Design an enzyme around this catalytic site. Structure first.
Site, PDB file in Angstrom:
ATOM      1  CB  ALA A  12      -0.957   0.010   1.181  1.00 34.85           C
ATOM      2  N   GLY A 144       1.064  -7.113   7.120  1.00 34.11           N
ATOM      3  CA  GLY A 144       2.098  -7.497   8.069  1.00 34.11           C
ATOM      4  C   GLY A 144       3.332  -6.610   8.014  1.00 34.11           C
ATOM      5  CD  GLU A 254       2.988  29.306   9.925  1.00 34.30           C
ATOM      6  OE1 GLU A 254       3.658  29.740   8.962  1.00 34.30           O
ATOM      7  OE2 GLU A 254       2.044  29.946  10.424  1.00 34.30           O
TER       8      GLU A 254
HETATM    9  N1  LIG Z   1      -5.437   2.408  -0.854  1.00 38.10           N
HETATM   10  C1  LIG Z   1      -4.682   1.303  -1.048  1.00 38.10           C
HETATM   11  N2  LIG Z   1      -4.764   0.278  -0.167  1.00 38.10           N
HETATM   12  C2  LIG Z   1      -4.021  -0.841  -0.350  1.00 38.10           C
HETATM   13  C3  LIG Z   1      -3.121  -0.951  -1.504  1.00 38.10           C
HETATM   14  N3  LIG Z   1      -2.507  -2.142  -1.453  1.00 38.10           N
HETATM   15  C4  LIG Z   1      -2.979  -2.755  -0.325  1.00 38.10           C
HETATM   16  N4  LIG Z   1      -3.893  -1.981   0.306  1.00 38.10           N
HETATM   17  C5  LIG Z   1      -4.578  -2.286   1.572  1.00 38.10           C
HETATM   18  O1  LIG Z   1      -3.538  -2.616   2.502  1.00 38.10           O
HETATM   19  C6  LIG Z   1      -3.965  -3.691   3.343  1.00 38.10           C
HETATM   20  C7  LIG Z   1      -3.099  -4.897   3.067  1.00 38.10           C
HETATM   21  O2  LIG Z   1      -1.751  -4.555   3.371  1.00 38.10           O
HETATM   22  P1  LIG Z   1      -0.544  -4.536   2.300  1.00 38.10           P
HETATM   23  O3  LIG Z   1       0.026  -3.129   2.292  1.00 38.10           O
HETATM   24  O4  LIG Z   1      -0.891  -5.156   0.986  1.00 38.10           O
HETATM   25  O5  LIG Z   1       0.400  -5.566   3.088  1.00 38.10           O
HETATM   26  P2  LIG Z   1       1.988  -5.439   3.251  1.00 38.10           P
HETATM   27  O6  LIG Z   1       2.275  -4.156   4.005  1.00 38.10           O
HETATM   28  O7  LIG Z   1       2.597  -5.628   1.886  1.00 38.10           O
HETATM   29  O8  LIG Z   1       2.271  -6.691   4.227  1.00 38.10           O
HETATM   30  P3  LIG Z   1       2.478  -8.247   3.786  1.00 38.10           P
HETATM   31  O9  LIG Z   1       2.011  -8.410   2.366  1.00 38.10           O
HETATM   32  O10 LIG Z   1       1.669  -8.923   4.873  1.00 38.10           O
HETATM   33  O11 LIG Z   1       3.974  -8.389   3.930  1.00 38.10           O
HETATM   34  C8  LIG Z   1      -5.421  -3.910   3.006  1.00 38.10           C
HETATM   35  O12 LIG Z   1      -6.236  -3.076   3.842  1.00 38.10           O
HETATM   36  C9  LIG Z   1      -5.526  -3.462   1.569  1.00 38.10           C
HETATM   37  O13 LIG Z   1      -6.855  -3.070   1.204  1.00 38.10           O
HETATM   38  C10 LIG Z   1      -3.082   0.194  -2.403  1.00 38.10           C
HETATM   39  O14 LIG Z   1      -2.342   0.152  -3.394  1.00 38.10           O
HETATM   40  N5  LIG Z   1      -3.864   1.253  -2.125  1.00 38.10           N
END
Ligand SMILES: Nc1nc2c(ncn2[C@@H]2O[C@H](COP(=O)(O)OP(=O)(O)OP(=O)(O)O)[C@@H](O)[C@H]2O)c(=O)[nH]1
Ligand SMILES: CC[C@H](C)[C@H](NC(=O)[C@H]1CCCCN1C)C(=O)N[C@H](C[C@@H](OC(C)=O)c1nc(C(=O)N[C@@H](CC2CCCCC2)C[C@H](C)C(=O)O)cs1)C(C)C
Ligand SMILES: Nc1ncnc2c1ncn2[C@@H]1O[C@H](COP(=O)(O)OP(=O)(O)CP(=O)(O)O)[C@@H](O)[C@H]1O
Ligand SMILES: Nc1nc2c(ncn2[C@@H]2O[C@H](COP(=O)(O)OP(=O)(O)O)[C@@H](O)[C@H]2O)c(=O)[nH]1
Ligand SMILES: [Ca+2]
Ligand SMILES: [Mg+2]
Lengths: 440, 338, 424
Positions: A12, A144, A254
């Protein structure tokens, strides 16, 4: 000077990073090779865009960014993608095996194997800064890596950088796009661990962004690409204060002074307007008063909650584009004449306002209309606590049965860490209750 | 001293409730047209709901939910199940049903019927029972008022020894707060004469009403099997429990039916309050799949269980509202997140 | 990459194993020589999960073929995809099982076990990042059940933090006359509940009943049963094999599906059932008892967790709507104390023969019906000690049958416990 270093953690954080940097390059006239014709000082400078981009002697403008993920897939797409020449390979850090939606793997088991390497690469960016302001950390609550690795990193950054500023952009989970049943656990664990180490955190509810894409952009089943392009605009609005200069610009520090009345109460609600399709924007100017009033409609919020049932402790407005003081002043005076917004009795009923004259940009082939003027409101409302309550309830439902807890215990965690994390959240919900009670 | 009025003399269930209330020493019965009552045990037909809750200084309570008739009339139940998106037209637990007026969905019935003839599959329906369409439509135009054609369960679960049909009656109490209480004792109303695939004339093996059963009484007293004995039968003969094999489905069906009409009938923000006792009638098939047959708005109890149930009604429906100077009910509640 | 190592043990294991490899090779565009002649880059993106890339741009199944009878492994080589397998991954015995678990687990299979481990080792050692192991086997015989579970135990010793996944075919008197199978099953389940992370319960009872009643097949054949087993296997591995967001590897699946470590026995499902639809129909059929590969009625318990995979070109909005729809209308059958426990994935590439399909993976408390059935048959012939000497002869104490009986009934009580639990 006043350099900011961005850290993008997990899928994400990384995918939102791409959208943010792409959008920054378009806003500043920087090409996908890092060249920026309009910049006459080659090799360095102290222009406003230099808070986010360093410069090479060859004229390349390089993001002050690290991308970290415990798995190579998502970052591999940055390494081979449209903007691969923008980043030095050392800024793109990947391991082999991810955290499998487990905070414990991200914080301890897998995370510890890559943490010194990440601090190393951050240190290299830090040492190129003449006056480092701080860090912006992008990450999911649910993943994670996003939860567990980010926590570990925030702890380590407090040690290695003292009280240097740390800001978070945190993606809050929604069932429409969630990939893990244990996301409530990961959210509570990371929020507990990160709370003392963060100065200001902007929560982005995926459900809120999902609804805006459906309702306002007529997108049937929004993907991450849809969500990230909208999230990017809101992030750009917030960092615009740092990246541009202007006579009426107010710096993000600010705003922070006004937004954070107590250290723990550091979660501002963002609201953005206008979000409109091209087809609706045709033959339709939205005035300053119109976009300002839209900041008080809950449908435009980045977090689902209701500030009409809470109290304000701060209200900041970050305008960009064709916006002049007279119109802002009139628009806000109407709002306070009209009421609709109640402040807690210990906070004066002001509105801190900034304006950057450079209008909003959109990415080619996207959903947003290019408009003449946009606004992002950052408010501090007791209502944001609703978001904590919804997660804390889901946490309790599972934890009463110890469901999935063995996955965390198996990686070294104790039940003590869960109950401690949950009590801290109960304390936070009580804090948000207490600040809204009237004074004696 | 709380006060009540009795307006249905034929109710065995509420005759006992009044008896228990008088025995407490803290309730007094008034004459039926004295309006200064706390509790109305109301009439079955034309109950004056509009007159309730307009007496200053009296909290008023009644033993019927206005609009609960939509669940308890056969033609209304079908229509409710067909038109409510919560239950839908694809509800898995209600036999395929169609409303049929005499001289409407007769055209839609014939279409689905004449699909099953070509399909070479069981095509028995109920009003009463026949497999050809001619005898049913002709029976209704001749019979009288609005009727329901419903799919007849070809393959019922049959008790042994004796190869017998049965239905399950479950008693449900909905209180003023809209808590749904399933009484822990239900009852199987059994056929005594063995079940027959071909013999639709003889309607003692096919219809399991406590009256229409009149051999009789052979296997159990008054053709009433209770849950302890029926649980044991399921354990011995089928290696399963009542709770697991049948009662989860009953719970689900009851809770779905009553939640669907809650907005239409709740007395939460009303000037008077309602409770009501319902009797749900279920049919079990040979796969141990439960089906709803009907909901009765004015059920009677089985002789053995009257005393316990009626005291339960007093405790949870009446004394909750009107307090005086071990729980027989299962509270049905479920909040799955999605 | 994230590599999985396949293992197939015994007659059943190798049969369903072979068909699994036929089907997924078709999907990924791999012919029996092991060359890619497909039409889409999405076929290759995660090919390394199941296939090693050899010289000459060729793809070899990371599969290890095992049996105590040398005969069943001749028929595999003779098979349509027989040539594709690595010749030195064939590890065969002499005697055969005799449908005796002890032979497979303690004596004959024990003598062979190091030879299998040598091959497992060589596959594992040249993996960039090993996910874990996938074993196909039956629980009714002697090799698949007894040696297969020994294999499991021995692989855990050397790869203790890797995911152990089985496809475990359950015995039914409706398919096999062998009176001893209840023992073999109970002793196997005893192993599986301790030493696997996720077990797909492939129930021959269910596979026969689907063929006889629904498919209207008068004399169902092992080939008729395996048409269902292979479709199930393609479906439940789709998320591992193609690019996707949800349950994309064995550990993420386990974390979504297993709330309690012992409760890792899943109940797969599939729509449409066929022999050799709209999203609302696929969605309704998926949660209906007829389409389950375990002879359990989901309406007789509650779902702890569910994965639903939709394959084909369909509206993702419509799937989302129908999957909400089915949860609302069936809310009582989902534990209230695990919020958001049903996950949904949509893969555009449909399976061969169908234009759209649906695969169901449920962790239901109703699975206890399966274990109770086995437990009744076990305890029929264990009270009278029928044929104990087959096992006592190989060195087993009678006490190990009691322990195994007791652990399988402990598992039953545990499913019931979480079936009866509320949020209050
Ligand atoms: N807005 C948004 N949410 C995302 C995206 N990719 C994953 N998510 C959200 O992030 C969460 C899943 O976590 P990820 O960030 O995919 O997991 P990670 O941090 O890669 O951790 P692991 O895969 O467990 O190692 C869920 O709530 C998804 O809906 C993105 O590109 N945009
Ligand atoms: C005479 C006994 C018969 C054969 C037996 N019935 C019983 O054992 C009864 C006896 C009464 C008590 C109850 N049992 C179940 C019976 O019908 N067994 C069947 C298995 C039997 O049919 C066989 N099937 C095959 C078979 O699948 N061969 C297929 C190819 C493979 C041959 C190698 C092994 C895997 C199958 C080819 C066929 C044409 C196909 O693809 O459909 C070989 S033998 C099982 C599925 C129930
Ligand atoms: N679809 C169906 N399949 C099998 N049996 C059915 C059936 N519909 C009704 N029956 C049988 O008929 C019996 C009585 O029918 P039902 O309960 O629908 O009417 P009822 O009890 O309101 C008759 P009345 O209104 O005269 O008192 C049931 O107990 C059941 O055994
Ligand atoms: N579904 C299915 N079941 C099988 C197959 N082969 C054997 N079985 C079942 O497996 C059990 C016997 O095990 P088997 O694999 O023959 O023993 P092993 O080879 O000694 O391990 C019996 O319950 C059979 O019904 C098959 O190809 N498909
Ligand atoms: Ca410069
Ligand atoms: Mg990840």
């Amino acid at each position: 000077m006043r350099e900011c270093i961005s850290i993008h953690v997990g899928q994400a954080g990384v995918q939102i990073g791409n959208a943010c940097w792409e959008l920054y390059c378009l806003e500043h006239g920087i090409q996908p090779d890092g060249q920026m014709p309009s910049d006459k000082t080659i090799g360095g400078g102290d222009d406003s865009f230099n808070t986010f981009f360093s410069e090479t002697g060859a004229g390349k403008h390089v993001p002050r960014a690290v991308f970290v993920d415990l798995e190579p897939t998502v970052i591999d797409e940055v390494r081979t993608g449209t903007y691969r020449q923008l980043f030095h390979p050392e800024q793109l850090i990947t391991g082999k095996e991810d955290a499998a939606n487990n905070y414990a793997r991200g914080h301890y088991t897998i995370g510890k194997e890559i943490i010194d390497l990440v601090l190393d690469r951050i240190r290299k960016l830090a040492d190129q800064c003449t006056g480092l302001q701080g860090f912006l950390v992008f990450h999911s609550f649910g993943g994670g890596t996003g939860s567990g690795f980010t926590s570990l990193l925030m702890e380590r950054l407090s040690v290695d950088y003292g009280k240097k500023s740390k800001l978070e952009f945190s993606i809050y989970p929604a069932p429409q796009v969630s990939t893990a049943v244990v996301e409530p656990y990961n959210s509570i664990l990371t929020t507990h661990t990160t709370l003392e180490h963060s100065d200001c955190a902007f929560m982005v509810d995926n459900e809120a962004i999902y609804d805006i894409c459906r309702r306002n952009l007529d997108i049937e089943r929004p993907t991450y690409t849809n969500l990230n392009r909208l999230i990017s605009q809101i992030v750009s609005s917030i960092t615009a204060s740092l990246r541009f200069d202007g006579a009426l610009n107010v710096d993000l520090t600010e705003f922070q002074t006004n937004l954070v009345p107590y250290p723990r109460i550091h979660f501002p609600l963002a609201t953005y307007a206008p979000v409109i399709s091209a087809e609706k924007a045709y033959h339709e100017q939205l005035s300053v008063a119109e976009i300002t009033n839209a900041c008080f409609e809950p449908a435009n919020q980045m977090v689902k909650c209701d500030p009409r049932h809470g109290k304000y402790m701060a209200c900041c407005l970050l305008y960009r584009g064709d916006v002049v003081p007279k119109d802002v002043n009139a628009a806000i005076a109407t709002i306070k004449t009209k009421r609709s917004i109640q402040f807690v009795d210990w906070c004066p009923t002001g509105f801190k306002v900034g304006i950057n004259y450079q209008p909003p940009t959109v990415v080619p082939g996207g959903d947003l209309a290019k408009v003449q003027r946009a606004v992002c409101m950052l408010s501090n409302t007791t209502a944001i606590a609703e978001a904590w309550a919804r997660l804390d309830h889901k946490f309790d439902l599972m934890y009463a049965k110890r469901a999935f807890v063995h996955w965390y215990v198996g990686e070294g965690m104790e039940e003590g860490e869960f109950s401690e994390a949950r009590e801290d959240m109960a304390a936070l919900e009580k804090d948000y209750e207490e600040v809204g009670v009237d004074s004696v | 001293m709380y006060t009540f009025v009795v307006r249905d003399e034929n109710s065995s269930v509420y005759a006992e409730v009044s008896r228990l209330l008088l025995a407490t020493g803290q309730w007094k019965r008034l004459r039926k047209d004295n309006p200064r009552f706390n509790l109305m045990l109301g009439e079955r037909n034309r109950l004056p709901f509009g007159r309730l809750g307009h007496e200053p200084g009296l909290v008023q309570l009644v033993n019927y939910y206005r609009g609960a008739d939509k669940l308890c009339r056969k033609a209304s139940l079908v229509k409710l199940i067909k038109t409510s998106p919560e239950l839908s037209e694809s509800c898995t637990w209600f036999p395929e049903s169609y409303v049929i007026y005499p001289t409407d969905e007769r055209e839609v019935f014939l279409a689905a019927y004449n699909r099953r003839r070509e399909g070479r599959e069981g095509n028995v329906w109920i009003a009463l029972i026949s497999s050809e369409a001619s005898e049913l439509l002709d029976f209704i135009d001749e019979q009288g008022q609005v009727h329901v054609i419903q799919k007849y369960l070809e393959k019922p679960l049959l008790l042994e020894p004796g190869h017998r049909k049965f239905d399950i009656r479950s008693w449900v109490l909905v209180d003023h707060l809209y808590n749904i209480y399933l009484y822990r004792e239900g009852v199987l109303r059994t056929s005594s004469e063995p079940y027959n695939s071909a013999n639709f004339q003889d309607k003692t093996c096919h219809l399991t009403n406590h009256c229409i059963q009149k051999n009789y009484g052979r296997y159990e007293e008054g053709n009433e099997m209770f849950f302890e004995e029926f649980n044991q039968y399921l354990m011995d003969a089928l290696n399963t429990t009542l709770e697991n094999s049948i009662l989860l489905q009953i719970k689900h069906i009851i809770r779905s039916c009553l939640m669907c009409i809650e907005p239409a009938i709740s007395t939460k923000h009303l000037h008077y309050q309602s409770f009501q006792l319902f009797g749900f009638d279920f049919m079990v098939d040979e796969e141990l799949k439960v089906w709803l047959i009907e909901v009765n708005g004015a059920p009677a109890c089985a002789q053995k269980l009257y005393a316990e149930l009626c005291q339960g009604i007093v405790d949870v429906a009446i004394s909750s509202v009107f307090p005086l100077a071990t729980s027989i009910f299962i509270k049905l509640h479920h909040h799955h997140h999605h | 990459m994230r590599e999985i190592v396949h293992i197939q043990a015994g007659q059943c294991g190798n049969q369903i194993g072979a068909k699994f490899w036929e089907v997924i090779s078709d999907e990924h565009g791999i012919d029996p020589t092991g060359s890619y002649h497909g039409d889409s880059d999405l076929q290759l993106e995660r090919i390394n999960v199941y296939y090693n890339e050899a010289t000459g741009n060729k793809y070899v199944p990371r599969a290890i073929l095992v049996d105590l009878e040398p005969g069943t492994m001749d028929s595999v080589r003779s098979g349509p995809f027989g040539q594709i397998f690595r010749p030195d991954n064939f590890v065969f015995g002499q005697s055969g099982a005799g449908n005796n678990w002890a032979k497979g687990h303690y004596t004959e299979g024990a003598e062979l076990v190091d030879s299998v481990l040598d091959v497992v080792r060589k596959e594992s050692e040249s993996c960039d990042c090993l996910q874990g192991f996938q074993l196909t086997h039956s629980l009714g015989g002697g090799t698949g059940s007894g040696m297969g579970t020994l294999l499991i135990s021995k692989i855990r010793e050397e790869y203790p933090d890797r995911i152990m996944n089985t496809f475990s075919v359950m015995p039914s008197p409706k398919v096999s006359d062998t009176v001893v199978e209840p023992y073999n099953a109970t002793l196997s389940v005893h192993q599986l509940v301790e030493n696997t992370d996720e077990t797909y319960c492939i129930d021959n009872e269910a596979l026969y009943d689907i063929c006889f009643r629904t498919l209207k097949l008068t004399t169902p054949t092992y080939g008729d049963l395996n048409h269902l087993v292979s479709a199930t296997m393609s479906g439940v591995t789709t998320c591992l094999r193609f690019p996707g967001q949800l349950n994309a590897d064995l550990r993420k699946l386990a974390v979504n599906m297993v709330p309690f470590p012992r409760l890792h026995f899943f109940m797969p499902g599939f729509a449409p059932l066929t022999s050799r639809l709209t999203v609302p129909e696929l969605t309704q059929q998926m949660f209906d008892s007829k389409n389950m590969m375990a002879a359990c009625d989901p309406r007789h318990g509650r779902y702890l967790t569910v994965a639903a995979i939709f394959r084909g070109r369909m509206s993702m909005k419509e799937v989302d709507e129908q999957m909400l729809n089915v949860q609302n209308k069936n809310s009582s059958y989902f534990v209230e104390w695990i919020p958001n426990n049903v996950k949904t994935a949509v893969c555009d590439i449909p399976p061969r023969g169908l234009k759209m399909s649906a695969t169901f993976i449920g962790n239901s408390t109703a699975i206890q019906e399966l274990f109770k059935r086995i437990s009744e048959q076990f305890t029929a012939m264990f009270r009278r000690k029928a044929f104990l000497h087959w096992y006592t002869g190989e060195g087993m104490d009678e006490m190990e049958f009691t322990e195994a009986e007791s652990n399988m009934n402990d598992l039953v009580s545990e499913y019931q416990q979480y079936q009866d639990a509320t949020a209050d």
